[PDB]
RNA sequence: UUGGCACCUCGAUGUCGGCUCAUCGCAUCCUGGGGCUGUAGUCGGUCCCAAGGGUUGGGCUGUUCGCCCAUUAAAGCGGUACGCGAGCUGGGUUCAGAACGUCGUGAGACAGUUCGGUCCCUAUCCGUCGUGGGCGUAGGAAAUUUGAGAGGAGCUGUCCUUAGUACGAGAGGACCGGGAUGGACAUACCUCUGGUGUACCAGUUGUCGUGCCAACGGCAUAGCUGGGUAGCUAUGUGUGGACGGGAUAAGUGCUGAAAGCAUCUAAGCAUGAAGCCCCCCUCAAGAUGAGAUUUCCCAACUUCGGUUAUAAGAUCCCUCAAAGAUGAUGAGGUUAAUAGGUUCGAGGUGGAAGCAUGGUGACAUGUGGAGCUGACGAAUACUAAUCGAUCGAAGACUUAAU
């Protein structure tokens, strides 16, 4: 719709790179628990990227301490301070739905 | 997005016959709901038979039908070939709107009401 | 389920009141000079002039 | 006290200053006009009337409600207006701020920031009782012929006859609803548009009415 | 966890190692609960030498679900197991270790004790 | 409640316990307002006024009961053919089989147990929930409205401060006041997290076809498997029960006599409840008591004290939806963007065909952000809404004052 879109535009960034599914990221976020500001990272696999526009979002899976863990996070959000692409995987489908019930030499994936 | 009180599985296969038969008499009789959605579906082969590419040739081969006509008698040329030939050099400068529906009133025995669906 | 009265005359005069037929939409054709229903074809010419 | 009508547009969602997540809801108000002011000593109250969209003129032979017909462009041409596809009332805005032919532009509405909004819902058709009022179903197994059919309609005899607001099943929505203390974010008046935080009642191209919170 | 016949798992250093829910506290008819709230749970299974016998009626806490948590910040975070800390009456723990990450909600439960001792939050 | 009586029903008024949906009484379980204490405080006892709203989930028995586990501000008691079988369950109790204990010479019986064992009906009338057509409202029409009168909603926990203050020798620990967040229950909605998505994309097994290769089609639950737009959706996202006004109940009263003092009362003034009437939300002039406002139309006649056809408007028919069982409602009908095509987009799928190159081959890479695409957003009369028809006003009589 056009008039959505031009209410909506003051609100998208450019400062974000690009990355499909597979590629591994390290997403920078601001976190203010505590007393003020500080910073905390996350290293994980791109398993899902749903569409829109101001309403983009993307989910990010790691394994910690032997159990996985899951963020998803709108890509617009101003919470996010950097966003680093390190690996990019080979990959035959959007949706990576079947990372969940492997784990292992099995999840591992390939590198282009 | 009409059903025509049939199942999936023949609401495809009566759609790929009666698109056959028009584009092989040019002209027929049916009831209103089957002119309506047969509109759309036989307004979009014409469209592929007008870029001429083998892709396109490919695709409509999905959806016509094996079907000789002996009328032209130069070698029977099939459905698919009086497509992309006779039918595609016509309607070269018209985009859109390659059919016409007539009505002529309801059937007796049954109370449908009949309609004729020919080519522009 | 089952009826406990017989219906009378007048109950069931009053009921079919609106159970009536309904009068085409005809007009007399430009060409044929006969009637036609509106957006129909003259089944005794064969002229449309949409 | 304040009010304008609009149209639904849909649904989006804008960030606050700290990160917050906010869903909205765009409305759009361009032509509102005022046609008619009733007073005490004259129409027993005092209110104003408004039109919110611009129908086309008058024509010999009209079929449809786009063109105006004429009993509706004289009572229009008195304010030196066009005709208007929608007219309402507002009986909580003051009546001597306001001359007839005044434009009702949508930054009249800032530092008010609560409002209601009133709108007709969409509206189901013929549902049934556990879909219209929410009631619970029978056992699904068991060897129990009771899924969603209604329960017991009265008492044996007590009263012989079912009292008068029964929930039984019918035609559900298309009802006047209003949602109350609502917020505005932001006003664009580039584009005539008001983002209100939440959601409001009816399709996405519905005639909504914006007025200053009740309570 | 959620509903009454949930079964969890102990992530902290104690004996118990499967809990099973009894009851969600808070409010009279409350359906389900999530990381943060307390629960009545029952033990059935657990180590020899642990503290906590095998059925016993103690507390517990929410620390890792399925279902996830929403923020404010419109950002998601999900699990892959549901586990619990059998807590004392006093909101302390009952052990002295704690596996497995947990989310910063139980900060804002005033769960002090539990985030430190936890390798991950 | 267990009985007494035998007045209605034996050409027939179907049981116990549930389930689903409720209603109503107050002899009040919780919440609100008050006396008196053998009432220090925190907590209680008992009694009065109050029916607005609330008043859990499981284990064991066919059950009601009853006991137990864990909670809650509280887990109140009664009526309606012990509410309810043309609404539904059949576990117990009254069918035909068989067995045990007991009784009988016997056929068989329980003052007792055990396993098994068909619940049928297309709604005529009243009643109830939705939705149309007539006539009326003293000319014929199009919009916006007042509200007589009805309906809906009414609940409550835990923390923080006042204040570790009042009280008490200590342990303990507040009272109308100010803030912050929950439970349950209503309601609107699909941006977000999920489900569905049989005319969307991709992978794959067996077999039969398009003459063969390649590429495709039919049938095997939609053959199966991995994703998914619109629409509809809760477990998901917002909001709500918020402040005040006017008269009262039980209470406390202020003046004041009958009765030189006393006394809330017999005249005269106050104060005082989640309850009463308003405030909040929805429907409402068939409210025959049929209301009000703005605007539109108002001529030709044998001079029936009437009539015709039109006028402003509304339909027939046709293209459609945000509406919908049908109808009604809403958008439009070429003096036109209503729908379908066509040309660009968003979203989904994730790398088409052909050809070239590298391998004995199964396959891989390149051409290439490929190809395809139902419902969503724009532009465009190419196709179909043709030509036409029908309905629809000339405004009664009385006073009173002009």
Partial sequence: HKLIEAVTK???????????????????????????????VFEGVVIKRRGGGVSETFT???????????????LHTPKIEKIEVKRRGKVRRAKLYYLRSLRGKAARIQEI | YRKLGRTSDQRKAMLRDLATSLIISERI???????????????????????????????????????????????????????????????????????????????????????????? | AVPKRRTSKTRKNKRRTHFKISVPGMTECPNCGEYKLSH?????????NG | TKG??????????????????????VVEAKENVVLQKKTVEVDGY???????????????????????????????????????????????????????????????????????????????????????????????????????????????????????????????????????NLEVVQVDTENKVILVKGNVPGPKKGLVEIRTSIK | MIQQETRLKVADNSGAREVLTIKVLGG???????????????????????????????????????????????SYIKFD?????????DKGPRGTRIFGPVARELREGNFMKIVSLAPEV
């Fill in chain 4, 46 to 180: 005092n209110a104003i009337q408004v039109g919110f969209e611009d129908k086309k003129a008058y024509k010999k032979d009209a079929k449809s409600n786009k063109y105006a017909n004429k009993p509706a462009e004289g009572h229009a041409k008195k304010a030196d207006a066009a005709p208007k596809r929608f007219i309402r009332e507002f009986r909580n805005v003051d009546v001597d701020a306001y001359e007839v032919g005044q434009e009702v532009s949508v930054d009249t509405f800032v530092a008010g920031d609560v409002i209601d909004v009133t709108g007709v819902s969409k509206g189901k058709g013929f549902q049934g009782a556990i879909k219209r009022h929410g009631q619970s179903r029978g056992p699904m197994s068991h060897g129990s012929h009771f899924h969603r059919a209604p329960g017991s309609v009265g008492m044996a005899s007590d009263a012989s006859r079912v009292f008068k607001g029964q929930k039984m099943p019918g035609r559900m929505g298309g009802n006047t609803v209003t949602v109350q």
């Fill in chain 1, 10 to 40: 003051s609100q998208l960034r450019t400062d974000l790179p690009s990355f499909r599914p597979g590629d591994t990221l390290r997403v920078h976020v601001r976190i203010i628990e505590g007393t003020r500001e500080r910073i905390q």
């Fill in chain 2, 29 to 120: 009789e049916t009831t209103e709901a089957r002119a309506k959605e047969v509109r759309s579906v036989v307004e979009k082969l014409i469209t592929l038979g007008k870029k001429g590419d083998l892709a396109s040739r490919r695709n409509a081969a999905k959806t016509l039908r094996n079907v000789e006509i002996l009328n032209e008698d130069e070698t029977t040329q099939t459905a698919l070939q009086k497509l992309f030939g006779e039918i595609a050099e016509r309607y070269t400068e018209r985009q859109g709107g390659y059919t016409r529906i007539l009505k002529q009133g309801p059937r007796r025995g049954d109370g449908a009401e009949s309609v004729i669906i020919e080519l522009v």
């Fill in chain 4, 4 to 25: 304008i009508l609009g149209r639904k547009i849909g649904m989006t969602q804008v960030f606050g200053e700290n990160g917050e997540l906010i869903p909205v809801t």
């Fill in chain 5, 81 to 89: 197991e549901n586990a619990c800390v059998i807590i004392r009456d």
């Fill in chain 5, 28 to 74: 009279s008819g409350r359906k389900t609960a999530n990381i943060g709230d307390v629960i009545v749970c029952t033990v059935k299974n657990a180590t020899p030498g642990g503290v906590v016998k095998k059925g016993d009626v103690v507390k517990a806490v929410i620390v890792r679900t399925k279902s996830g948590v929403r923020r404010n910040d419109g």
């Fill in chain 1, 60 to 74: 990010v899976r790691k394994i910690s301490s032997g159990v996985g863990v899951e963020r998803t996070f709108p």
């Fill in chain 3, 40 to 48: 129909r074809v003259c089944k005794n010419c064969g002229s449309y």
